[PDB]
């Protein structure tokens, strides 16, 4: 099991980091959502689907900068939605074959009442998201530990 980026980059067998970038709406109101979809940004596939099944959960999100500043909300993994910055572990996706398969995981984050103005500044770590992978197969468990960076502002309308 190991995953790689749309930024060209990867976390291989045994976990470890990475960093991922990602593009923002640029105007978010408040009573509306920043949608932030890492399916679009992080994949990963099975080395052995044969003989093993992978199990792949969200263990942890955590937020950052800007929106843990100006932000609250969800994140939806694989159809259903929980708090965000998290407070338990997700259930698990199963990863069953060789070829590549989006994580399933987006942010859903709407202003606090009293955001307003850039929220969210260009370059900044906006999240980690940390992907814990086991199977039915050995012991393995497994941190893929994903970095999340804001390529552009996101400004909240004073109207
Ligand atoms: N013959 C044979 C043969 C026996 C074992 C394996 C083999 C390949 C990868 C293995 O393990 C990797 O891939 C698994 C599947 O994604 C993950 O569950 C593991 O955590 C690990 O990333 C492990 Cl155990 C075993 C491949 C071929």
Same mark, same amino acid.
């Given at each position: ?8 980059? %990867? ?5 470890? =980091? ?16 920043? @949608?932030?979809?890492? #399916?679009? $940004? ?16 969200? $263990?942890?999100? +955590? %937020? ?10 969800? @994140?939806?993994?694989?159809? +259903?939605?929980? /708090?965000? /910055?998290?407070? =338990?572990?997700?259930?698990?996706? @199963? &990863?069953? +074959? ?9 942010? &859903?984050?709407? /202003?606090? #009442?009293? %955001? ?11 999240? @980690?998201?940390?992907?814990? $992978?086991?199977?039915?197969?050995? =012991? ?16 909240? /309308?004073?109207?």
């Amino acid at each position: 099991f190991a995953c790689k980026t749309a930024n060209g980059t %990867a976390i291989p067998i045994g976990g470890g =980091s990475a960093n991922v970038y990602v593009n923002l709406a640029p105007v978010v109101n408040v009573g509306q959502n920043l @949608v932030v979809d890492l #399916s679009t $940004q992080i994949f990963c596939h099975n080395d052995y689907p044969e003989t093993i099944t992978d199990y792949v959960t969200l $263990q942890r999100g +955590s %937020a950052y900068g800007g929106v843990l500043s100006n932000f609250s909300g969800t @994140v939806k993994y694989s159809g +259903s939605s929980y /708090p965000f /910055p998290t407070t =338990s572990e997700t259930p698990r996706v @199963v &990863y069953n +074959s060789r070829t590549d398969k989006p994580w399933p995981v987006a942010l &859903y984050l709407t /202003p606090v #009442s009293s %955001a307003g103005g850039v929220a969210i500044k260009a370059g900044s770590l906006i999240a @980690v998201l940390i992907l814990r $992978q086991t199977n039915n197969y050995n =012991s393995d468990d497994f941190q893929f530990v994903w970095n999340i960076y804001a390529n552009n502002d996101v400004v909240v /309308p004073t109207g």
